[PDB]
Amino acid sequence: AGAQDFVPHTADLAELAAAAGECRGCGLYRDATQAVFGAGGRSARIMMIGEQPGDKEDLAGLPFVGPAGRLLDRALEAADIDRDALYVTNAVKHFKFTRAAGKRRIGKTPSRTEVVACRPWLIAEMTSVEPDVVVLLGATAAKALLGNDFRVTQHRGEVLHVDDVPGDPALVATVHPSSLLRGPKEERESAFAGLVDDLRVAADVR
Ligand code: SF4
């Protein structure tokens, strides 16, 4: 189902990434510029998963390059997180979007079907990196591993462990960094410190 037959039998991230460029596991490859695979090395101890590449990522060919990526980088700073320790990816690897009437590309939420279709890449990445801890950045990513009914709001910052996940890594669900780019300054400050806390929990896993 989905991307399964497009995934090669290798843990090599370069080769996985190249194969993802050829994926037709759902419809999203058609309109997107290219696949945006994860970034980092198989030595990474912390895997971070967002929803999908955004406008800038789709064209940069790298995850977390936009304003959300800047904000996340500021949080890793405050959490004493070393980028050498990070593998960062997204639950789906092709940007799903529409053009706004007023010409910037606006991301659209991946359907559960698209998440499940792309999940074999995520499993391949998880099997390749063998992380100690996986940070789920927002509801789409968290549901991809924790179930379609999972609520980030009720469990954020808790160390979770599900038996059906490769290598039984610890799992920490947190807010989507994009959500912290909007709202009252004092609320964004509180949300940022909560993200930092969730990141410190993950970094303190072992
Ligand atoms: S979003 Fe994922 S499953 Fe769908 S075509 Fe792209 S790489 Fe394949």
Numbering used by the authors: 2 to 103, 105 to 208
From the manuscript:
UdgX excises uracil from uracil-containing DNA to concurrently form a covalent bond with the resulting AP-DNA. Structurally, UdgX is highly similar to family-4 UDGs (F4-UDGs). However, UdgX is unique in possessing a flexible R-loop (105KRRIH109). Our earlier studies allowed us to propose a reaction mechanism of UdgX, which involves the formation of a covalent bond between H109 of UdgX with the C1′ position of the target deoxyribose sugar concurrently with the uracil excision from this site in DNA.
Substitutions of His109 in MsmUdgX with Ser, Gly, Ala, Gln, Cys and Lys showed the loss of its covalent complex formation with DNA but gained canonical UDG activities. In the reactions of the mutant proteins with ssU9, the entire substrate was converted to product by the H109G mutant, while hardly any substrate was utilized by the H109K mutant. We note that smaller and hydrophilic amino acid substitutions at His109, such as Gly or Ser showed higher Kcat/Km values. Further, the overlay of all the structures of UdgX H109 mutants showed that the overall structures are very well conserved with a Cα RMSD of ca 0.2 Å. As anticipated, we note a clear difference in the sizes of the active site cavities in the various mutants. When we arranged the mutants in the order of increasing cavity sizes (left), we noted that the canonical UDG activity of the mutants increased with their increasing cavity sizes to begin with and then with a further increase in the cavity size, the UDG activity declined (right). It suggested that the initial increase in UDG activity (H109K to H109Q to H109G) occurred because of the efficiency with which the water molecule could be localized to make a nucleophilic attack on the C1′ position. Interestingly, G109 the smallest amino acid substitution of H109 showed lower cavity volume than Ser, Cys or Ala due to an overall structural change near the active site.
